[PDB]
DNA sequence: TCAATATCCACCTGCAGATTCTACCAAAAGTGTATTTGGAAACTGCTCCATCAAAAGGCATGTTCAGCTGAATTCAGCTGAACATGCCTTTTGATGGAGCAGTTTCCAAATACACTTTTGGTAGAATCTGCAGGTGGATATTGAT
DNA sequence: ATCAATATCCACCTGCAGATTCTACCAAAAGTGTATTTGGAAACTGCTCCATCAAAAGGCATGTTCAGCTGAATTCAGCTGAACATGCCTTTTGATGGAGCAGTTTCCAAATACACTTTTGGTAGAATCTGCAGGTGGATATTGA
């Protein structure tokens, strides 16, 4: 009888603090900042998707994700984007 | 309610004209007025076409903010602030 | 039994990587999905809006303000070649535009 | 006198002036109305979400400021000030609006 | 390997408006790729509808709906009838 | 007894429908959604070959060409709208010269 | 001792190429220029024979297109000619470098 | 090796495009313009083609890569 | 117009490079049973959308008046089309042969499931503070003389 | 080359409407415990992809000429900007009545799980033909006088 829904909020706070440890960010900001953060991941998980069928594999890796990755970022932005997600994943394969 | 007519006409000259100031638009041909409108009607009746799709695929009565969110994308207008 | 550790903490994330997870599996991009996909795609996601987020304060503190608002997003984006081609066909609500007057209209 | 500003001179002010803010330049409820019409004509008794009705002129807004740009450029490139509907069709065919 | 293809059915469709023409390779080719995107754009659409409205099925419905977002005027009507044409035909025995 | 000729037509009903379950589009699809698409697609189909054929005789021809489909594309409002961002291999482009051009 | 004059043998170049459909550049150059470019992004490549084409006709009908764009500029400036800049402003307005 | 686009060609081209006369500038313009629109449309097709494990560049991969760039190609594929 | 170039559109006509139309087979597709399950009817709580009322002011409308801007004209360097002429690079053609891209055939590592715990979010009250909206002296800019 | 007639700046100033802080349910994540298979390796295979390499023109640089074109420069009619005086209608603020949105049960009808039985659709082939290419002439379209 309430119908909680989610959001990205929680996080994109968390790390608004690390860049910017005193700033804050008014809702209509917050709001533009969910939608940012679905676009892209609509789009990375999209081409992601493509990728696998184009390749008769049934399952995503994070390997699909990389290629999309590249696919979709600019230069720069797909080396940084790339370096973090390697270093995220072998960090957490390391139980 | 009660009866809404030629309401395109709301769209003033101040108006078109400030959206033409934020368009960095000096100079205005007074045969501007009359186009912007021609293009403001044919761009919302397209969103709202599509919009009130979805909003009928849903089976309701209400346009949402979404509705028109997922019109604005499928036309490549995507927009950022109400959800989605 | 093992205390719980959300897979984020031990990827050292800030977003939430279950939700990455959950998500790929509702939208009916793949048959399954691997453990390291939330990981990656988790991480990027979150490095990306650290990368505004970091450009916006910039920009919310060269206003004078402390509290980031949508102009300060479109300004932050406009101005970085990268995040301008990203969301290059993307409307910021409340954004406005960048200040921007052509040459041949300034008096002479 | 009276004081009096030359020709451009408050046109290039107001360029300034509506560069410098993010706040919708078209009257609220002339817009609404002009999109319960235009949605009557698709569907009879429909109702919406003020927000819907928010996120649309958020959309036509940009839109347009997008056009005036394009619009402005193709003036500037027939080494004119000016604006004309010429002007408008040029940027929209380019564009692929209405080829 | 099996490499399959619409170039059966192209043809015997080719064949009923134009009995008396043919069709060339390239050609044919260009014919599929269409009715590859066609059945792309129409199934995603279609997949997305779903999504929105919390539905976990794509039916024929969804199918018309992405029609009717997709194609133009005319083009969208004749679409959408031969479409249901189809389905009640189908459903009858 | 092909479920394809229960809804008298060409295209293959079952194809498709295996192609959608296939294609991550849902997580289920209906019985009616191949038909339905299916009877889409041949529609469509027939349409690009009619016109198609038609400049295939105009051109004297009796084979349709790549040309023979793209004067039958950018020749409709509507086709030309549908596929408005695709390229026909092999189909040039529409005989047109600006008249500011034209001599005299 | 005869003389098409300016301008006229080029209509019957238009009126000539649009009528046609056949690729425009020769290939071989073409072939070279792609693998040439595919190299700075990984060596030792190869390119099935078809590749090459599907590159080929991409390319033309995107340049033959902008031609259009561009032709339309130079009018609508008044000209009749295609200046680099004409080029730019069709680019500029496609999204293509805004 | 860009060079190798030779004015005739560009010419022909334009001409195709309806271009009456052409301005000497642009010939290296367009061969700017076609140079960016092959590395573009190269450079995300080798990416599939380098995700299938593959030294050998196909036509689907040109063709996918022109999907992504929105220049859709029918003919080659899909 | 007249009339000499050059073109360009038709009018037939024969061979073969590609349509085609076959003969035959794995591989979908279709048939039959059992499961599983998706949400469509059927209610209902209640959020927020449609209307309204009333008032004051921010603005849209018209109007003058004239500063410039768009445009019509006039005027030539010179840039870029039309021809020729000189051959260099691109085609046309198998032909050889192996770099590769498929293709089965295991299976260990990786996923998916099915409950069972645990607990990281989310929907509200509390409790604050950026900063919006005024105020008004500087200072810059702008247009007059 | 100075003047005010304005517009633009900004440093303060202070409620109050949005944050931001503080708390209780839960609808997911987070564990284990089995089950299921995906998709790399290996072992070879038949396909193309890459080089040779030997002519052979077709198509491309250079040049020579000069015919329009694309910039300038002027000049002026008249259109669009800048101002004002009016007074209309968009804003603002709740106050209230419910339409219809959504949250919750309960299912038949509808789509999914295998496990065999059947054509169907695709390859590699023998059958066929539609145009491409050429060659002639005969109108066309140009362009000079
Ligand atoms: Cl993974
Ligand atoms: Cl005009
Ligand atoms: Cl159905
Ligand atoms: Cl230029
Ligand atoms: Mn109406
Ligand atoms: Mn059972
Ligand atoms: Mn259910
Ligand atoms: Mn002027
Ligand atoms: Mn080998
Ligand atoms: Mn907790
Ligand atoms: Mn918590
Ligand atoms: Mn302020
Ligand atoms: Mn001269
Ligand atoms: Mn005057
Ligand atoms: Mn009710
Ligand atoms: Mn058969
Ligand atoms: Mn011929």
Same mark, same amino acid.
């Given at each position: ?17 690390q860049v ?13 900042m ?5 676009? /892209?991941?609509? %789009?990375?998980?999209?081409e =992601?998707? +493509? &990728? ?7 399952? /995503?890796?994070? %390997?699909?994700?990389?290629? =999309?990755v +590249? &696919? ?8 940084h984007?790339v370096?973090?997600?390697?270093? =995220? ?6 139980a | ?9 709301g ?21 501007i007025?009359?186009?912007?409108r ?9 969103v709202?076409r ?11 009565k209400?346009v949402?903010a ?5 019109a604005l ?10 959800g989605? | ?15 939430p ?11 009916n ?11 990656y795609?988790?991480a990027?996601?979150?490095?990306l ?9 910039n920009?919310a ?12 997003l ?16 993307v409307?910021?609500?409340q954004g ?13 | ?14 360029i ?5 803010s ?21 569907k009879t ?16 807004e ?7 740009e394009?619009?402005n ?15 408008i ?7 692929g609006?209405?080829?």
């Open positions: 009888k309430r119908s909680r829904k989610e959001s990205y909020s929680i996080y994109v706070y968390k790390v608004l603090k910017h440890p005193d700033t804050g960010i008014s809702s209509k900001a917050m709001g533009i969910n939608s940012f953060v679905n676009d /892209i991941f609509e %789009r990375i998980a999209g =992601a998707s +493509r &990728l696998a069928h184009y390749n008769k594999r049934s399952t /995503i890796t994070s %390997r699909e994700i990389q290629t =999309a +590249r &696919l979709l970022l600019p230069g720069e932005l797909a080396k984007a370096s973090e997600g390697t270093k =995220a994943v072998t960090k957490y394969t390391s | 309610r009660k009866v809404l007519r030629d309401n395109i006409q769209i003033t000259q101040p108006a078109i004209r400030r959206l033409a100031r934020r368009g960095g638009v000096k100079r205005i041909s007074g045969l007025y009359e186009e912007t021609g293009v403001l009607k044919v761009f919302l009746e397209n709202i599509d919009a009130v799709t979805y909003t009928e695929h849903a089976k309701r209400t949402t979404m509705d028109v969110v997922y994308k499928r036309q490549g207008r995507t927009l950022y602030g109400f989605g | 039994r093992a205390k719980a550790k959300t897979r984020s903490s031990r990827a050292g994330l800030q977003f990587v279950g939700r990455v997870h959950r998500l790929l599996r509702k939208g991009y793949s048959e399954r999905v691997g453990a390291g996909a939330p990981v795609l988790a990027v996601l979150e490095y809006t650290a990368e505004i987020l970091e450009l916006a304060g920009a503190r060269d206003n004078k303000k402390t509290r980031i608002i949508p102009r300060h479109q300004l932050a984006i406009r101005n970085d070649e990268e995040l301008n081609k990203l969301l290059g066909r409307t910021i609500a406005g535009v960048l200040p921007n007057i052509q040459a041949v209209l300034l008096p002479k | 006198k009276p004081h009096r500003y030359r020709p451009g001179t408050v046109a290039l002010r107001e300034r002036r509506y560069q410098k993010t706040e919708l330049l078209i009257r609220k409820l002339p817009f609404q109305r002009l999109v319960r019409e235009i949605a009557q004509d698709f008794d429909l109702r919406f979400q003020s927000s819907a009705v928010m996120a649309l002129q958020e959309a036509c940009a839109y347009l400021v997008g056009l005036f394009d619009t450029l193709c003036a500037i490139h027939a080494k004119r000030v000016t604006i004309m509907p010429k002007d069709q040029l940027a929209r065919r380019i564009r609006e209405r080829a």
